[PDB]
Amino acid sequence: NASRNAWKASGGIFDIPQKETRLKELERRLEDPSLWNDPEAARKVSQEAARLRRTVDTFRSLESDLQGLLELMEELPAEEREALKPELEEAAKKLDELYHQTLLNFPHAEKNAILTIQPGAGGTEACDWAEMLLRMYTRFAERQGFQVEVVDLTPGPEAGIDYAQILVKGENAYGLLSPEAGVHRLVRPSPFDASGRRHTSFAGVEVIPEVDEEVEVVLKPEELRIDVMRASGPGGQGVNTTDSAVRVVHLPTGITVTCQTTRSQIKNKELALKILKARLYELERKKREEELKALRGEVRPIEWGSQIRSYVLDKNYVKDHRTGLMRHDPENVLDGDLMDLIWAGLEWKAGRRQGTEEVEAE
RNA sequence: UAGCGCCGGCCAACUCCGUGCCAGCAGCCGCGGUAAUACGGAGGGCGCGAGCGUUACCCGGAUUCACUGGGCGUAAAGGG
RNA sequence: UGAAACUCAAAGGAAUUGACGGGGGCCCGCACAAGCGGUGGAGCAUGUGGUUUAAUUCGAAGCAACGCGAAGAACCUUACCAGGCCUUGACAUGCUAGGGAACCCGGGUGAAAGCCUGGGGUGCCCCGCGAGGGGAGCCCUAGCACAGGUGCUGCAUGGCCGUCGUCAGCUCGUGCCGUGAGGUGUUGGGUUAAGUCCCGCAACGAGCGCAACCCCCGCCGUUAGUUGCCAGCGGUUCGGCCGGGCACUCUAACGGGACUGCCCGCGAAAGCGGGAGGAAGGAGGGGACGACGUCUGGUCAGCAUGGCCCUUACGGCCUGGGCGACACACGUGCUACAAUGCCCACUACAAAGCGAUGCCACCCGGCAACGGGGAGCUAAUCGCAAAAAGGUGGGCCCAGUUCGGAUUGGGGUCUGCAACCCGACCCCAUGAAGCCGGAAUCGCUAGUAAUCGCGGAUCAGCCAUGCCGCGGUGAAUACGUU
RNA sequence: GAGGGUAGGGCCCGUGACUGGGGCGAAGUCGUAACAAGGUAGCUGUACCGGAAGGUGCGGCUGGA
RNA sequence: AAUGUAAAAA
RNA sequence: CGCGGGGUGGAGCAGCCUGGUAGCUCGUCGGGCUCAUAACCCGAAGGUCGUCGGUUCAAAUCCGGCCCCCGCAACCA
RNA sequence: GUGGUAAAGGAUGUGGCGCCGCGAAGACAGCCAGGAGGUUGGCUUAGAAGCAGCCAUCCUUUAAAGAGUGCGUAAUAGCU
Ligand SMILES: [Mg+2]
Ligand SMILES: [Mg+2]
Ligand SMILES: [Mg+2]
Ligand SMILES: [Mg+2]
Ligand SMILES: [Mg+2]
Ligand SMILES: [Mg+2]
Ligand SMILES: [Mg+2]
Ligand SMILES: [Mg+2]
Ligand SMILES: [Mg+2]
Ligand SMILES: [Mg+2]
Ligand SMILES: [Mg+2]
Ligand SMILES: [Mg+2]
Ligand SMILES: [Mg+2]
Ligand SMILES: [Mg+2]
Ligand SMILES: [Mg+2]
Ligand SMILES: [Mg+2]
Ligand SMILES: [Mg+2]
Ligand SMILES: [Mg+2]
Ligand SMILES: [Mg+2]
Ligand SMILES: [Mg+2]
Ligand SMILES: [Mg+2]
Ligand SMILES: [Mg+2]
Ligand SMILES: [Mg+2]
Ligand SMILES: [Mg+2]
Ligand SMILES: [Mg+2]
Ligand SMILES: [Mg+2]
Ligand SMILES: [Mg+2]
Ligand SMILES: [Mg+2]
Ligand SMILES: [Mg+2]
Ligand SMILES: [Mg+2]
Ligand SMILES: [Mg+2]
Ligand SMILES: [Mg+2]
Ligand SMILES: [Mg+2]
Ligand SMILES: [Mg+2]
Ligand SMILES: [Mg+2]
Ligand SMILES: [Mg+2]
Ligand SMILES: [Mg+2]
Ligand SMILES: [Mg+2]
Ligand SMILES: [Mg+2]
Ligand SMILES: [Mg+2]
Ligand SMILES: [Mg+2]
Ligand SMILES: [Mg+2]
Ligand SMILES: [Mg+2]
Ligand SMILES: [Mg+2]
Ligand SMILES: [Mg+2]
Ligand SMILES: [Mg+2]
Ligand SMILES: [Mg+2]
Ligand SMILES: [Mg+2]
Ligand SMILES: [Mg+2]
Ligand SMILES: [Mg+2]
Ligand SMILES: [Mg+2]
Ligand SMILES: [Mg+2]
Ligand SMILES: [Mg+2]
Ligand SMILES: [Mg+2]
Ligand SMILES: [Mg+2]
Ligand SMILES: [Mg+2]
Ligand SMILES: [Mg+2]
Ligand SMILES: [Mg+2]
Ligand SMILES: [Mg+2]
Ligand SMILES: [Mg+2]
Ligand SMILES: [Mg+2]
Ligand SMILES: [Mg+2]
Ligand SMILES: [Mg+2]
Ligand SMILES: [Mg+2]
Ligand SMILES: [Mg+2]
Ligand SMILES: [Mg+2]
Ligand SMILES: [Mg+2]
Ligand SMILES: [Mg+2]
Ligand SMILES: [Mg+2]
Ligand SMILES: [Mg+2]
Ligand SMILES: [Mg+2]
Ligand SMILES: [Mg+2]
Ligand SMILES: [Mg+2]
Ligand SMILES: [Mg+2]
Ligand SMILES: [Mg+2]
Ligand SMILES: [Mg+2]
Ligand SMILES: [Mg+2]
Ligand SMILES: [Mg+2]
Ligand SMILES: [Mg+2]
Ligand SMILES: [Mg+2]
Ligand SMILES: [Mg+2]
Ligand SMILES: [Mg+2]
Ligand SMILES: [Mg+2]
Ligand SMILES: [Mg+2]
Ligand SMILES: [Mg+2]
Ligand SMILES: [Mg+2]
Ligand SMILES: [Mg+2]
Ligand SMILES: [Mg+2]
Ligand SMILES: [Mg+2]
Ligand SMILES: [Mg+2]
Ligand SMILES: [Mg+2]
Ligand SMILES: [Mg+2]
Ligand SMILES: [Mg+2]
Ligand SMILES: [Mg+2]
Ligand SMILES: [Mg+2]
Ligand SMILES: [Mg+2]
Ligand SMILES: [Mg+2]
Ligand SMILES: [Mg+2]
Ligand SMILES: [Mg+2]
Ligand SMILES: [Mg+2]
Ligand SMILES: [Mg+2]
Ligand SMILES: [Mg+2]
Ligand SMILES: [Mg+2]
Ligand SMILES: [Mg+2]
Ligand SMILES: [Mg+2]
Ligand SMILES: [Mg+2]
Ligand SMILES: [Mg+2]
Ligand SMILES: [Mg+2]
Ligand SMILES: [Mg+2]
Ligand SMILES: [Mg+2]
Ligand SMILES: [Mg+2]
Ligand SMILES: [Mg+2]
Ligand SMILES: [Mg+2]
Ligand SMILES: [Mg+2]
Ligand SMILES: [Mg+2]
Ligand SMILES: [Mg+2]
Ligand SMILES: [Mg+2]
Ligand SMILES: [Mg+2]
Ligand SMILES: [Mg+2]
Ligand SMILES: [Mg+2]
Ligand SMILES: [Mg+2]
Ligand SMILES: [Mg+2]
Ligand SMILES: [Mg+2]
Ligand SMILES: [Mg+2]
Ligand SMILES: [Mg+2]
Ligand SMILES: [Mg+2]
Ligand SMILES: [Mg+2]
Ligand SMILES: [Mg+2]
Ligand SMILES: [Mg+2]
Ligand SMILES: [Mg+2]
Ligand SMILES: [Mg+2]
Ligand SMILES: [Mg+2]
Ligand SMILES: [Mg+2]
Ligand SMILES: [Mg+2]
Ligand SMILES: [Mg+2]
Ligand SMILES: [Mg+2]
Ligand SMILES: [Mg+2]
Ligand SMILES: [Mg+2]
Ligand SMILES: [Mg+2]
Ligand SMILES: [Mg+2]
Ligand SMILES: [Mg+2]
Ligand SMILES: [Mg+2]
Ligand SMILES: [Mg+2]
Ligand SMILES: [Mg+2]
Ligand SMILES: [Mg+2]
Ligand SMILES: [Mg+2]
Ligand SMILES: [Mg+2]
Ligand SMILES: [Mg+2]
Ligand SMILES: [Mg+2]
Ligand SMILES: [Mg+2]
Ligand SMILES: [Mg+2]
Ligand SMILES: [Mg+2]
Ligand SMILES: [Mg+2]
Ligand SMILES: [Mg+2]
Ligand SMILES: [Mg+2]
Ligand SMILES: [Mg+2]
Ligand SMILES: [Mg+2]
Ligand SMILES: [Mg+2]
Ligand SMILES: [Mg+2]
Ligand SMILES: [Mg+2]
Ligand SMILES: [Mg+2]
Ligand SMILES: [Mg+2]
Ligand SMILES: [Mg+2]
Ligand SMILES: [Mg+2]
Ligand SMILES: [Mg+2]
Ligand SMILES: [Mg+2]
Ligand SMILES: [Mg+2]
Ligand SMILES: [Mg+2]
Ligand SMILES: [Mg+2]
Ligand SMILES: [Mg+2]
Ligand SMILES: [Mg+2]
Ligand SMILES: [Mg+2]
Ligand SMILES: [Mg+2]
Ligand SMILES: [Mg+2]
Ligand SMILES: [Mg+2]
Ligand SMILES: [Mg+2]
Ligand SMILES: [Mg+2]
Ligand SMILES: [Mg+2]
DSSP, rough: OOOHHHHHHHHHHHHHHHHHHHHHHTTTTTTTHHHHHHHHHHHHHHHHHHHHHHHHHHHHHHHHHHHHHHHHSSSSSHHHHHSSSSTHHHHHHHHHHHHHHHOSSSTTTTEEEEEEEEHHHHHHHHHHHHHHHHHHHHHHHHTTTOEEEEEEEOSSSSSSSSEEEEEEEEESSHHHHHHHHHHEESSSSSSTTTSBBBBOEEEEEEEEEEOOGGGGGGGOOGGHHHHHEEEEOSSHHHHHHOOEEEEEEEEOOOEEEEEEEESSHHHHHHHHHHHHHHHHHHHHHHHHHHHTTTTTSSSOOOOOOSSSSETTTTTTTTHHHHHOOSOOOOHHHHHTTTHHHHHIIIIIIHHHHHHHHHHHHH
C-alpha cells in the first residue's frame, strides 16, 4: 500500500505550494478595515480564507503520517513495527477523507445517475461489445453496493443490443460513473468473422442525474396580457356591438395566440389561454432539452476516430488514454474493477483538468 | 565557417531504443492496431556542399493527340 | 448535339489455376432407404452455460469443446480464496565474513507453520608432549551474484495431438506444348478398396501415398512335458491324490498353409462370374500404420522456448475454505416404468488380467459390512473367483405392484492424523417421479446391435454409472442411389 | 465631337428561401435485382406500374440452353 | 426456401 | 356548456345486449432445425378490464358520479 | 355641514359608566448619575460579541442594570 500513500501525498502536495502562496495574498488582504467596509468584497475574501481549512489539515496531518511511519516501519516481524502499523489504519480512514474531498465536488455527484450504452462503428460485432459493457457497468454497481434499475433495453439483429439505458440507484452514483462517458475501443478476433482476424469496434456511453418541472407557474396572471375587441366576419348587429375577440399575449416571451371562433368572450379567453399554455409549454420544454444539447456540448464526439480507453483482449491489456494508465486484466476490468481506476485516474484527471483550467484560464 | 536532403520499394544508404491505427508519414504502392530498416530520437551509412531541400509553372518521360509514331470483333472507339 | 465541378487508383479485355453452383455425367461411405435398439420425458450420476460467492483457479467452443487435460480434489492434490508466518529463499551454482563440527534429544509458545530456547556433543586436517589456534565438511546468521513465477502472449515458437480422412490423392526429372500464368505425364477405354492393374497415348520414367514386410484370431505339423490326462493299466482318505505316460488339451517359439493356383464361361489383357479341392478363398476376420497439405484448430497449465511483466513480493510455508455453491439451460451417462418380468433357493459353462507389510485359503464371532485367529503364495503350483445372463424348483398375478428404488430418519463398520463442509459400505425403517416420453435426434451391416457379467490402469479410501480391455448368450435388415 | 442623360435589348459573373439529382463516408434500416438455370436465363429500346431494388407487355440480342 | 459488416498474405 | 360512441395481458382487437367461465393475432420466455441469425416447428407464461360508489348471492358485463380518447353539434340576429 | 343617507379595517376626536394597578413612606412626564461583571450564554454560520436563524429560565458588586428593547458595524464599541 506504500504506493497509493505517496500518491495521495503527491495530490495533497501540489495543493500545498499553490494554495500556499494563494493564501498569503488573501490573508494580508483581510487585515485592512477598508477591505471590510466593502461588504460583498470581503465576503469572497473570507471565502478563500475559508478554503484554507481544507488546505491546512491535509498537508499537516498527512505530512506527519508519512515520516512517523517511515521510521518505525522499515524492518521487524513482531514487536514495535506491528505497533506502528495499526496507527496508520486510522490514517487509512484519513486517506478516506481525502478521497471524498476530491470526488464529492461535482454539480450532482451525490445523486443517482443514468447510464446509456449505444453501439457504433463495428457492425454486429460493435453491438456485441455494447452488451459486454452493459454487464460490465451493471456488475460494478452490484459490488459498489448499488441498485440497478434498467430503464430501457433493445437487443440487436444478431448479437443482442442496439441500445440500452440504466438507472444506478444509490449515492455518488453520478460522481462515480461521471468519468465514463465517451467512446471505448475494443480489439479482438471477431466472433463473427469467418477468418477471425483482429477487428476494432466502438461503443458509446453517457451519464446524467435527474430533475424537475415548471409548467403552470407561468400562467400566473401578472405575466400575460389579455385584450378584448370586436370579432370579425359574420355576426350581423351582434358581431358589430359585441366584442368577443380575445388575444392573450405572453409578455415574458412575446408569444401570442388570438381567438374569435365562438360568440362568447369568456369561452374564447378560455380557449386562447388553453392554447398559449401548450405553445409556451413546448418552448420551455425545448429549452430544457436545449440545455441537454449544451450537455451534448460538454462532450459529443463521433464514433471511432475518437476513444477514451482501449480494451484489447489479444495481448490482454486495457488502456485509459486520458491518463496513460494501463492494466493487463481486461477480464477483471470487464467485471467491476473500476474503483481504483475511476478513483485516481478518472477523478484526478477530470477534476484536475477542469480545476486547473478554472484557476488558470477560466 | 559546414551545412542540408535522404537511408521500406522505385532509389545509393541499416541497426538500436521509444512508440502503439495514437503520435505521426505520404510522390505513387502503402507504413503505425506492443516487439516498425516506412512515425520519432540515436549510432552508423548513402548523396551533394556555400549550399541542400520545398512549393509553383514549362518541355521530358508520354509512341498518353502517334507527321516522324497509335488505334476502333470482345479492352475506350464503325455512323442504324 | 453534349460538358464541368467534384471524386476514385483504378476501371477493364483475354486466358490460367482453384473454390463454389437451388449444372451435368460416372462413383463411393450405416449418407439416405430397409431394419434393431436408443437419447430428448422421469430419478440419479457426470461435464458445461448462467447466476451466486470471500473465493466458487485455469484451459477446451459446431462438426473436430461439453464422463474432454483429470488413469482417482476430504487435508495432499491445488494453480483460487481468508488468516498466521519466511522474505537470497523449498531446490542450483558461486564468492566472502564472523560463531559452531558433524549429529541427536527437548522444553515455553501457536491453529499449524513459524518464532523464543535448554541439553548431549566434540569426530576429520596442520603445529606442538600439552595448551592454544589454523584448515575441510556440515549448520546458524550477515552480504552479493542469483533463485522462484501454473504471471502474459499457442496470433512470436519446438514438441506432441485433433481434423478433413484410410479419402486416393499430392508431386518431381527430362522432353514437348503455350508470349505467359500454365499445360502434359496424372487425361482417355476397361479394372479394382485404391493414381489396383491392363490397354491406349507426347511423353518416358521416378518419388510421398495405396498394397505388401510387423502384431492378434481361424486349420495343421516341429521342439518343450510340474497344465491336462485312467485317453491306458494299478493302488484310491475315489480329488488326476500316488505310480505312471504326453498321446490329446493347453502353454509358447518356429514353421506349413491361399497364389484367382485348379475346373468351367466372358475378356485384347487386366479382370470378372460360377464350380472343386480346402480349416479357410477372390483383401478370410480384427489390429498397428494416417501422404502434399488444410483449419492464424489445440496446448506457453506436461515439458521446452523468443518477448514481456513481478521481485519482502505476481515468490514460499501452514491452518481453514473452495473447486462439491443452485431460481436455471444443454451435452455424455446410469437405473427404470415391470410378466420375453421381479423375488428366493439350488446347480452349471469363460476370457484376459492382476497379487508376497499385496492377493488373503479355512475357522471363529456378527443379520451384515467388518473384525479376531490363521495356512499358503515373488505366483500355468496358493490367492482375488461366486462370472453373469443361463438351467431346474418355489413364490407374486397386473397393481404404481414383491414394478421402480429416489428421498429422509435411525443405528453401525472400514481407510486415513481428520470423513461438518465432502468418502465408501451395511442393516432397519422410510418408500419419490416415473404406466415408454413434444418438436427433434444418436448408434450399428454379423459373432455386429442388443444384452450379461469379469478384469485392469489410477489409488489410503473413493464420490467409476467414467475409461481401457475380456469373455458369455446372440438378431434384424439392405428393392435401390431419386 | 469627349462625355453625360434617358429608354430598351444581348452575353457573362456573383448571390437566393427552397428544390433535383450526383460523389464520398470501417458502422444503420429495408429487402435481395445481378454474378451458378443466382433458384422466373440475362440484357436491351420502349410502355405501363410498384417503398426499393424491380416487375410485366411488345419486339430485339446472346454477351443463354 | 432470405442474409452474414468492419484489421490476415517477405 | 350539448348529444353519441369507447377505456380489456407489452401492441391492436374480441367478451358486455341476454351477469357465473377473460378469447384471437403479433410480441414475450423455454426448447429445437442452422455454421449462425431470420423464417419455420414444439411448450409455456402474461391481464387491478380508467378510478371512486352502488344493485346482486355474484359485476369486465347492470346503474350513478369523476377522469382520459374519438364522432357530431354550437344557428337568427 | 356629521345631520344631508358605503364596508372590512383603522386612530392620544369628544362625552359617559365600570374594573385593575401606582402615589404625600413623593407617583406619571421631563430631567442628572450608573445602567456592570464570568458573558464574548450554549448551538450553527465565512462571520453570528444582549442584539440573523435554532435552544433556552445562572449568580455576583448593588438601592440598581433583562442570559436582553431598538437602531447600528463585516463582526465591535457605541446611543437607548
Ligand atoms: Mg501526526
Ligand atoms: Mg521522533
Ligand atoms: Mg499479529
Ligand atoms: Mg495500533
Ligand atoms: Mg484521493
Ligand atoms: Mg422507475
Ligand atoms: Mg429490426
Ligand atoms: Mg440477441
Ligand atoms: Mg460475418
Ligand atoms: Mg469455425
Ligand atoms: Mg400571481
Ligand atoms: Mg370580414
Ligand atoms: Mg354569411
Ligand atoms: Mg347568416
Ligand atoms: Mg351585446
Ligand atoms: Mg356591449
Ligand atoms: Mg367568428
Ligand atoms: Mg364555433
Ligand atoms: Mg429563455
Ligand atoms: Mg466515423
Ligand atoms: Mg473474478
Ligand atoms: Mg535526396
Ligand atoms: Mg536518385
Ligand atoms: Mg538501397
Ligand atoms: Mg501517445
Ligand atoms: Mg508500451
Ligand atoms: Mg520496435
Ligand atoms: Mg506489428
Ligand atoms: Mg521513407
Ligand atoms: Mg527512422
Ligand atoms: Mg548520423
Ligand atoms: Mg561554388
Ligand atoms: Mg509533362
Ligand atoms: Mg504531357
Ligand atoms: Mg507527345
Ligand atoms: Mg493505342
Ligand atoms: Mg478499319
Ligand atoms: Mg471516355
Ligand atoms: Mg453509311
Ligand atoms: Mg449515312
Ligand atoms: Mg453503335
Ligand atoms: Mg442517327
Ligand atoms: Mg465524348
Ligand atoms: Mg470528360
Ligand atoms: Mg456548372
Ligand atoms: Mg471446403
Ligand atoms: Mg449414422
Ligand atoms: Mg462400416
Ligand atoms: Mg433409417
Ligand atoms: Mg428417452
Ligand atoms: Mg432426462
Ligand atoms: Mg454445453
Ligand atoms: Mg447472493
Ligand atoms: Mg491460461
Ligand atoms: Mg473456465
Ligand atoms: Mg476424473
Ligand atoms: Mg493468502
Ligand atoms: Mg542460499
Ligand atoms: Mg570476491
Ligand atoms: Mg520442540
Ligand atoms: Mg516440562
Ligand atoms: Mg580432514
Ligand atoms: Mg589430508
Ligand atoms: Mg594436508
Ligand atoms: Mg596428511
Ligand atoms: Mg598431527
Ligand atoms: Mg603433531
Ligand atoms: Mg608430535
Ligand atoms: Mg593430544
Ligand atoms: Mg581439505
Ligand atoms: Mg577442500
Ligand atoms: Mg495454434
Ligand atoms: Mg505448434
Ligand atoms: Mg482431398
Ligand atoms: Mg490432379
Ligand atoms: Mg495436373
Ligand atoms: Mg472416351
Ligand atoms: Mg501406384
Ligand atoms: Mg497340434
Ligand atoms: Mg483303468
Ligand atoms: Mg480299473
Ligand atoms: Mg478299454
Ligand atoms: Mg503327477
Ligand atoms: Mg507358397
Ligand atoms: Mg488367370
Ligand atoms: Mg465358390
Ligand atoms: Mg489379414
Ligand atoms: Mg484391416
Ligand atoms: Mg499399409
Ligand atoms: Mg496455427
Ligand atoms: Mg484458443
Ligand atoms: Mg503462458
Ligand atoms: Mg514463455
Ligand atoms: Mg521464458
Ligand atoms: Mg508486486
Ligand atoms: Mg514493489
Ligand atoms: Mg496371511
Ligand atoms: Mg477373509
Ligand atoms: Mg456367524
Ligand atoms: Mg473383512
Ligand atoms: Mg479379516
Ligand atoms: Mg497345478
Ligand atoms: Mg481390485
Ligand atoms: Mg433369471
Ligand atoms: Mg418359475
Ligand atoms: Mg406411486
Ligand atoms: Mg449398534
Ligand atoms: Mg404422468
Ligand atoms: Mg402396470
Ligand atoms: Mg468394471
Ligand atoms: Mg481403486
Ligand atoms: Mg465399468
Ligand atoms: Mg455621341
Ligand atoms: Mg453616347
Ligand atoms: Mg453612363
Ligand atoms: Mg421617358
Ligand atoms: Mg443594359
Ligand atoms: Mg442567377
Ligand atoms: Mg443542393
Ligand atoms: Mg438517377
Ligand atoms: Mg440520392
Ligand atoms: Mg441535395
Ligand atoms: Mg447511384
Ligand atoms: Mg452509409
Ligand atoms: Mg442502428
Ligand atoms: Mg445500405
Ligand atoms: Mg443490410
Ligand atoms: Mg438473387
Ligand atoms: Mg429470387
Ligand atoms: Mg444467368
Ligand atoms: Mg424490358
Ligand atoms: Mg409503401
Ligand atoms: Mg421477349
Ligand atoms: Mg434485327
Ligand atoms: Mg449472356
Ligand atoms: Mg441444357
Ligand atoms: Mg438485411
Ligand atoms: Mg449488415
Ligand atoms: Mg461480406
Ligand atoms: Mg372496443
Ligand atoms: Mg365509460
Ligand atoms: Mg378508448
Ligand atoms: Mg372491457
Ligand atoms: Mg391496450
Ligand atoms: Mg392499456
Ligand atoms: Mg399496460
Ligand atoms: Mg361497454
Ligand atoms: Mg406466439
Ligand atoms: Mg424463442
Ligand atoms: Mg428461438
Ligand atoms: Mg460463424
Ligand atoms: Mg449461438
Ligand atoms: Mg432461432
Ligand atoms: Mg426485420
Ligand atoms: Mg414440456
Ligand atoms: Mg406456440
Ligand atoms: Mg402462444
Ligand atoms: Mg396462450
Ligand atoms: Mg391464460
Ligand atoms: Mg368497467
Ligand atoms: Mg368475472
Ligand atoms: Mg361543426
Ligand atoms: Mg335573418
Ligand atoms: Mg334560418
Ligand atoms: Mg352631507
Ligand atoms: Mg366601523
Ligand atoms: Mg377601532
Ligand atoms: Mg388608549
Ligand atoms: Mg422609594
Ligand atoms: Mg452591557
Ligand atoms: Mg462569544
Ligand atoms: Mg461561537
Ligand atoms: Mg456588550
Ligand atoms: Mg448584528
Ligand atoms: Mg432551578
Ligand atoms: Mg464607526
Ligand atoms: Mg467577524
Ligand atoms: Mg453593548
